[model samples]
Target: KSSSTPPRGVTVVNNFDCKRYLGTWYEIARFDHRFERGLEKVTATYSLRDDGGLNVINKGYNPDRGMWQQSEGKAYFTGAPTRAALKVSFFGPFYGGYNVIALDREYRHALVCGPDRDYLWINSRTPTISDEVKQEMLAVATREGFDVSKFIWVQQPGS
Candidate 1:
């Protein structure tokens, strides 16, 4: 059966604190996908829900459409709250993996992925992250079997 466990050889953050993770995160880079294609200034915001789940708000600007697009979703921890593994569903009754493979101690940056290597995202608390941090995330993604070359650098309003 499919599970929320990190991909083989990929390690997730230990003793993760979801409260600290709750906030806005800028999409620094991501593997291109139809849902987010051509979108700029993408950001994801997280908030707690009463049921121990999380409310997810994803926003992006579509220059072609000349408007901002937003998607609302929900995420539930796949295991213990201390683990950075979750399943998020934007569509009712359908879910996708949301695993944090790497995260900074300060929660300033994160490297996340889906159930497999096909989906990857590099996120930061701010619109931009240092080259050192970016490189570190890239290296982790590469080691975890993702194609770093396929990353589409996201455009942020602040940059």
Candidate 2:
């Protein structure tokens, strides 16, 4: 049986500006899973935590349960920090590598997918991105073995 998550077909492209990509970003969308189940409008606020690692704050709304879930974690980069590659763990015990696949020149937007098909995320310095930009990001995800229709477009809390 499958792991109970969506199947990402394959990533299509890759481009990123890593050096200038350090700053705050808000999670705009993601594929849902048991770890992130019952969540809607999920968002993540990312920044450098000063311990020489990235700090993560993930929050989401649960409509049926009428609650909010928040998870705080840290990620240590895998390659040189300038490469923007890192491994993150939230539930403790297991860590997954996160690679910044596509990023804008000004660090305004980014498309991140796991090393494989299990995870994918799109983030922005702002709450919203133009549809034109969104399509470009999705195209990259498609290259990383992701099927656009199979990936869940998360409902962000704002915009």
Candidate 3:
């Protein structure tokens, strides 16, 4: 049987801009997971907290349930403050890996993944990303051993 633990050798973005990265990011693509099943038009918003942590709000539409769902969480650096590696907890005292592997200079786009290959996301400031940009990001992901073949492109209405 396959191990429950995720894979190793995952990398994170260096000197990620937390300030510039704050705001709403449309989920362009992601690896399939039970937590977000049947969700469409997903988006995640981030804000800084007074205590120097980060607030995360993830929202998505459940087509099957015919409604929207939201989850609020908190994030804090698990490593160096300047690094893009962090831990986010939606359930009290139970945190999950949140690593940003690649981010565009303008902070308009980012490739985020978990501690291992178990999770991955392509986030953008806008609802959609240009094909060239998406392709470029995929190249980076492929080099890192993620099975991009399993990526599910998330839907966002009106582009």
Candidate 4:
């Protein structure tokens, strides 16, 4: 049976503060996926919802369509809020695992993954992150068994 737990050997951040994590985060890189294909300048914003869940808004620029594409979803912690593990659903009753496997002490940058290694993302508070941070995140992903070679570097405005 499919499980909600994270992949083997993947450890989520401890003492995670969702309130500090709320705001816009720029997508630096991600594994190519059908839903996000051909999208650039992607960003995600998080906020508290009325039901104690999280409101998620993902926006990306689609050059081919010449417009912005946005998807709104909801997420809730799977366990304690201090643990960076949650499930998000863009479609009703079809939640996907959202795990914060790596994060800086200040929460300015983070590495997130889905249920398994196939879904991975590197995010930062700014549109661009320093190479140091990039390498750090990559190293963590590598240790977690993700194939970093398949990463698609996201393009942000003016980058």
Model 3 stretches with alpha carbons more than 4 Å out: 1-7, 92-94
For residues 75-141, what per-residue lDDT tens digits would candidate 3 score against the true structure? 8887676888887878654457788889988999999887678689999999988899999999989
The per-model lDDT (C-alpha) reads 0.88, 0.68, 0.85, 0.90
lDDT of 2 by residue, 1-159 (tens): 132212334332234343355555667777766767777777666776667787777788889989988988777776556665677778765457677777766778877766567677888877777899889988887766676665666665356
Better by lDDT, candidate 4 or 3: 4
Off by over 4 Å in 2: 1-24, 157-159
Candidate 1 per-residue lDDT, tens place, 22-107, comes to 99999999998876887999999999999999999999999998999998999999889998989888865446888988888899
TM, every model: 0.93, 0.77, 0.91, 0.94
> Judged by TM-score relative to the true structure, which candidate is superior, 1 or 2?
1
How would you order the candidates by lDDT, starting with the best?
Answer: 4, 1, 3, 2
Compared with the true structure, what per-residue lDDT tens digits does model 4 show for residues 6-84? 7777899878999999999999999998878989999999999988899999999999989998899998999999999
Top candidate on TM-score is 4
Clashing pairs in 3: none
For all candidates, the clash counts are 0, 15, 0, 0
Question: What are the root-mean-square deviations of the candidates from the true structure over C-alphas?
Answer: 1.7, 4.7, 2.9, 1.5
TM-score between candidate 1 and the true structure: 0.93
Highest lDDT: give the candidate number. Answer: 4
